[PDB]
Amino acid sequence: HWGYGKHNGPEHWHKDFPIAKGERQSPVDIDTHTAKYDPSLKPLSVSYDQATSLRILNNGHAFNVEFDDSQDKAVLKGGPLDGTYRLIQFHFHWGSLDGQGSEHTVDKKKYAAELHLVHWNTKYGDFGKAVQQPDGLAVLGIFLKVGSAKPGLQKVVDVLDSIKTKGKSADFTNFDPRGLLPESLDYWTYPGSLTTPPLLECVTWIVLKEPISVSSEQVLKFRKLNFNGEGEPEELMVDNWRPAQPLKNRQIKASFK
Numbered sequence: 620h621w622g623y624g625k626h627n628g629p630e631h632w633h634k635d636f637p638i639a640k641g642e643r644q645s646p647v648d649i650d651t652h653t654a655k656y657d658p659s660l661k662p663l664s665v666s667y668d669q670a671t672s673l674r675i676l677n678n679g680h681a682f683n684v685e686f687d688d689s690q691d692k693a694v695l696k697g698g699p700l701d702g703t704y705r706l707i708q709f710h711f712h713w714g715s716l717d718g719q720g721s722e723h724t725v726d727k728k729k730y731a732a733e734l735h736l737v738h739w740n741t742k743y744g745d746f747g748k749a750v751q752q753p754d755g756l757a758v759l760g761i762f763l764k765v766g767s768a769k770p771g772l773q774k775v776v777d778v779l780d781s782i783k784t785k786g787k788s789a790d791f792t793n794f795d796p797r798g799l800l801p802e803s804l805d806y807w808t809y810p811g812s813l814t815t816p817p818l819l820e821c822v823t824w825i826v827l828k829e830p831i832s833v834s835s836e837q838v839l840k841f842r843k844l845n846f847n848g849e850g851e852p853e854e855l856m857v858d859n860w861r862p863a864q865p866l867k868n869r870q871i872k873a874s875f876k
C-alpha cells in the first residue's frame with residue numbers, strides 16, 4: 620500500500636494511480652515572480668464561525684480533524700471559487716527536520732509543514748461526488764514555519780498522544796480552525812489535484828502567502844506520531860509530503876500585488 624517510504628513513496632504512486640503523471644498534479648513550486656496578479660480575483664471569504672469539529676483520526680498517512688459537513692456551517696467562498704465549499708477536514712504534512720515538510724514550495728523554499736483545509740463544492744451534494752469533478756474541491760493551504768508557538772494549534776498537539784497509531788481516533792469537538800489562520804488572506808491559486816492517492820484532479824488550490832508560526836515543541840509532537848498501527852514496528856510519521864510536480868500548462872495567479 621502507498622505511503623512515504625523508500626519502497627512505497629511518491630515515486631511509486633504512478634504504478635497504481637497513473638494520474639500521478641497527469642496534467643494538473645499537485646503540489647507545485649510557486650514561482651513568485653512568474654505568478655501573475657489577477658485583479659479580477661475576489662477576496663477570500665472564510666466563514667468558520669459555526670464550524671463543528673467532531674473527531675481527530677490518525678489514518679496512517681496524516682491526522683485529520685473532521686468536521687460536521689452535513690450543513691453549511693464552515694464554508695469557503697470567493698477568491699477564485701464559484702459557489703460554496705464546505706469544510707470537511709483539515710490535516711497537515713510535515714518533515715523530519717524543520718527544513719522540509721511542506722508540499723507546495725515558494726521559489727523552491729520548503730517550509731516545515733503545510734496545513735490543508737479541505738472543502739467540497741456543495742453543488743455536488745457529497746464529497747465523494749465532488750472529487751469526481753474538476754471543480755469539486757477547494758483546499759486552503761497554509762505554510763508553517765518554526766518560531767513562536769501557534770496558540771490555536773495547541774489543542775491539536777495535545778490530543779496527538781491519544782491517536783499515536785494508524786486507525787486510532789479521538790473525540791475532538793469545539794475546535795475552532797480560525798485559530799490556525801495567519802493574519803493576511805493574500806493567496807496564490809491554481810488548478811490541481813489531491814496530493815495523496817487517488818491524486819484526483821479535482822482541486823482548486825488556494826495557498827496563503829503568509830505562513831503561520833508554530834513552535835519547535837509543537838512540530839516535534841507531530842513527529843512522534845506513527846505511520847504504523849498499534850502492535851506493529853514503530854515508524855515515525857514524518858516526511859508525509861509529496862514533492863513538487865510539473866506545472867505543465869498551468870498559470871498560478873496571485874491575489875495581491
Ligand SMILES: CCCC(=O)Nc1nnc(S(N)(=O)=O)s1
Nearest residue numbers: 620621622626627631632634635
Ligand atoms: C516493501 C514495501 C512494498 C510496497 O509498498 N510496494 C509498493 N509498490 N507501489 C506502491 S503504490 N500504492 O505507491 O503505488 S507500494
Ligand SMILES: CCCC(=O)Nc1nnc(S(N)(=O)=O)s1
Nearest residue numbers: 707708735737758812813814815
Ligand atoms: C474525508 C475527506 C477525504 C480527503 O480529504 N482526501 C484528501 N486526499 N488528499 C488531500 S490533500 N493533501 O490534497 O488536501 S485531501
Ligand SMILES: [Zn+2]
Nearest residue numbers: 710712735814
Ligand atoms: Zn494534504
